[PDB]
């Protein structure tokens, strides 16, 4: 695969690495998502618990306490905007 | 950098690489979009110009004939959904 497809593939793999641990196999519970963030996000392990909780809360748009793939994509987009904004100085 | 950041970072770097060719250094013209697709997407080199034109029409939400980073993020999300399905079961 080309660079772009590879990166997207890696992001999709990360989701499933954590979504299948408990409950529904295709959605992330509060526990799975927190673990994903602390282990896969560079600054994840240093964020306040309250902030991680707020982050997960906002990503759960339909309030079923799960973050499905579409809600995860929203998170990826937020991360991308953050990096892009920093580079534009 | 951790997995999430590495992948997101690369996707951001790819946008910046092709957006600075001509015109607005922060948006992709049709020609920049085409080069980006052809060189960074696995199926890019096989896509026809009519298909790139359709992609532009789809992604260009504000009608300026250019793909800004936000519209590019939407494209990335579409690709992620596609990849996610092949990984489901
Ligand atoms: Ca789960
Ligand atoms: Ca949800
Ligand atoms: Ca440009
Ligand atoms: Ca546009």
From Swiss-Prot, chains A, B:
A GO CC term?
Answer: extracellular exosome
Q: Which GO terms describe its molecular function?
A: calcium ion binding; calcium-dependent protein binding; monoatomic ion transmembrane transporter activity; protein homodimerization activity; S100 protein binding; tropomyosin binding; zinc ion binding
Query: Phosphoprotein: is it a keyword of this entry?
Result: yes
Q: What does this protein do?
A: May function as calcium sensor and modulator, contributing to cellular calcium signaling. May function by interacting with other proteins, such as TPR-containing proteins, and indirectly play a role in many physiological processes such as the reorganization of the actin cytoskeleton and in cell motility. Binds 2 calcium ions. Calcium binding is cooperative.
The record's section on SMART domains has: EFh (SM00054), S_100 (SM01394)
Any additional notes? This protein co-purified with the prolactin receptor.
Q: Which residues carry this modification: Phosphoserine?
A: 45
Q: What is this protein called?
A: Protein S100-A6
- Tell me the Gene Ontology biological-process terms attached to this UniProt entry: axonogenesis; positive regulation of fibroblast proliferation; signal transduction
Taxon lineage: Eukaryota, Metazoa, Chordata, Craniata, Vertebrata
Protein source organism = Homo sapiens
Q: Which UniProt keywords apply?
A: Acetylation, Calcium, Cell membrane, Cytoplasm, Membrane, Metal-binding, Nucleus, Phosphoprotein, Repeat
In the record, N6-succinyllysine modifications are located at: 46
> Quaternary structure per UniProt?
Homodimer; head to tail assembly of 2 subunits. Interacts with CACYBP in a calcium-dependent manner. Interacts with ANXA2 and ANXA11 (via N-terminus). Interacts with SUGT1. Interacts with TP53; has higher affinity for TP53 that is phosphorylated on its N-terminal domain, and lower affinity for TP53 that is phosphorylated on its C-terminal domain. Interacts with tropomyosin. Interacts with FKBP4. Interacts with PPP5C (via TPR repeats); the interaction is calcium-dependent and modulates PPP5C activity. Interacts with TPPP; this interaction inhibits TPPP dimerization.
């Amino acid at each position: 695969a080309c660079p772009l497809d590879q990166a997207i593939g890696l992001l999709v793999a990360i989701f499933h690495k954590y979504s299948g641990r408990e409950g529904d196999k295709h959605t992330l519970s509060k526990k799975e998502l927190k673990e994903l963030i602390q282990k896969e996000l560079t600054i994840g392990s240093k964020l306040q618990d309250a902030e991680i909780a707020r982050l997960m809360e906002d990503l759960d748009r339909n309030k079923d306490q799960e973050v499905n793939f579409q809600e995860y994509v929203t998170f990826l987009g937020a991360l991308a905007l953050i990096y892009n904004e920093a580079l534009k100085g």
